[PDB]
Design a protein around this ligand. Structure first.
Ligand SMILES: NC(=O)c1ccc[n+]([C@@H]2O[C@H](COP(=O)([O-])OP(=O)(O)OC[C@H]3O[C@@H](n4cnc5c(N)ncnc54)[C@H](O)[C@@H]3O)[C@@H](O)[C@H]2O)c1
Ligand SMILES: NC(=O)c1ccc[n+]([C@@H]2O[C@H](COP(=O)([O-])OP(=O)(O)OC[C@H]3O[C@@H](n4cnc5c(N)ncnc54)[C@H](O)[C@@H]3O)[C@@H](O)[C@H]2O)c1
Lengths: 283, 283
């Protein structure tokens, strides 16, 4: 009969994955049901037991389990090994494969727009789950250099370690700089082909903030990408659009991220345009 | 919807179970936020499936062959009837505390009760000593039946019948006796004193569909109530003999519907849409 696909996260409040996945599955009439489960670090190992025992087809993974999940799969992709976090598990007859679709999804959205990131230079803001996933995938896709900026918080040392892993295991060049070093930021922005916000700046309670203070730094030839999807148009994207830049919003990454999970689980093509419409992703 | 809770069915194999359709139609009719799904679970994977059930916060699960006996050691509490049977077909998860019930027993008994029959103080001839027969015998004893005259051939279930009889005789006020099906004089005499005859054996179901444990239809007095656990076919040979003799009868679907209704109510705390499900299932 139907096979189950889970989501293992805590809290699972208002995630868009259940609606996206069930709408897509129902569109093609596929024999799967996606359901979210409140699972945290203390219950994750037993949830995986459950995933194997019940013969679940797989599960999505979100906070606080993305790092822990790497230790519960039999095989990780090269990008997931650079990130040290996964958001997708596929159960192939008891053999678990882990993937990070946030990285591939963001890169796909960029590629769909017509931008070729091979040999380009990126200024990446942040060093959490979104930023590291994007940086890892960008490196694998042949981006020349990623100039990563992060403030002096808990993620700074994570950024340093992340850059070390990318520099030693890919041909990409990753640098890490304090967001407070304004001169270095301006210099990096000047050299950039793509600016990517992977921070929580732009999302509530930081919805009225942007890491760009001087819009003249936003040259029209600069591509600006955003991970934040609530609100749909962040302050940064508004600045970028007003400056005449091409942009890619959070829904781009979210949709493609989702498409990739769907395809790994079902082996069928994701009904992208349909999902985009039903989810109201186009303003 | 992400608010939905999961109710499983843990069995092997999962063939033509009517539970998924019944429960989901009923859940939908009531607009309740539950999804019922079947999972292939055997004695080897059952322990881990229960860890899954707790970790994922499933509302509960149906249990069927080959796990009904094993399941008793994985719940925290068993109803008195389940203690007599040594098997459950229902688990309810109340915040991590698991309760085990056997709705096969209560369902068959509810079916009888609905027909207008009062089993308090009555005598039953019970055929068999497997899961269905012991579930019925246990609940009937708890319902106040005076005596259960159980008949079983000399196969692996005969010693089980004896042990079952002892548990019932020692923990209820009901008197249970166990006799060899081959003892025709014993059978004839028990039938003459019976108020109710219940088939809990596989006789009547393929490949024994052309068989009935009643060889002389005159033994079926019109006042005798005949109930049948076999539901495929709907009209067993025994039920045809009984209706032909003027007996009041209860078929396998009576038991199946009420078994289901009781599981639904235990998991949801809401009324089962009985008239609706009877209608949509085709009964
Ligand atoms: N579109 C998508 O599919 C998608 C996927 C993943 C994440 N996201 C979004 O990306 C954003 C980041 O998520 P994450 O999981 O990577 O978060 P995280 O907690 O893992 O990382 C947070 C990052 O933001 C930085 N940061 C936080 N507050 C800051 C501030 N006031 N100023 C400057 N920097 C600050 C931190 O240093 C860190 O680098 C969120 O808004 C999230 O909703 C979107
Ligand atoms: N209507 C329902 O909801 C419902 C629920 C449970 C079981 N059932 C039905 O009840 C029947 C028995 O199921 P069970 O799970 O108790 O099986 P079981 O394997 O647990 O027990 C089988 C019983 O049948 C007897 N038996 C088998 N072959 C026989 C034969 N040739 N002659 C005489 N006796 C014989 C055995 O001695 C034993 O008593 C099945 O047909 C099943 O479909 C119906």
């Amino acid at each position: 009969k139907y096979e189950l696909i889970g989501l293992m996260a805590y809290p699972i409040r208002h995630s868009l994955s259940p609606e996206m996945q069930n709408k897509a599955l129902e569109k093609a009439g596929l024999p799967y049901t996606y359901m979210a489960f409140e699972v945290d670090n203390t219950t994750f190992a037993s949830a995986i037991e459950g995933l194997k025992a019940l013969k679940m087809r797989g599960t999505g993974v979100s906070m606080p389990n993305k790092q822990l999940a790497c230790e519960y799969v039999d095989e990780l992709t090269p990008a997931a090994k650079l990130v040290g976090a996964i958001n997708t598990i596929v159960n192939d007859d008891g053999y678990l494969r882990g993937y990070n679709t946030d990285g591939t999804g963001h890169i796909r959205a960029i590629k769909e727009s017509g931008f070729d990131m091979r040999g380009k230079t990126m200024v990446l803001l942040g060093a959490g789950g979104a930023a590291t996933a994007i940086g890892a995938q960008a490196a694998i896709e042949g981006i020349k250099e990623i100039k990563l900026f992060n403030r002096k918080d808990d993620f700074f040392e994570k950024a340093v370690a992340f850059a070390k892993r990318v520099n030693e295991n890919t041909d990409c060049v990753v640098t890490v700089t304090d967001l407070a070093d304004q001169h270095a930021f301006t210099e990096a922005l000047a050299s950039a082909d793509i600016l990517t916000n992977g921070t929580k700046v732009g999302m509530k309670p930081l919805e009225n903030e942007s890491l760009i203070g001087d819009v003249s730094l936003l040259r029209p030839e600069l591509l600006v990408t955003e991970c934040v999807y609530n609100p749909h148009m962040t302050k940064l994207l508004q600045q970028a659009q007003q400056a005449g830049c091409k942009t890619i919003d959070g829904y781009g990454m979210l949709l493609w991220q989702g498409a990739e999970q769907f395809e790994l689980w079902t082996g069928k093509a994701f009904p992208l345009d349909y999902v985009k419409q039903v989810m109201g992703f186009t303003a």
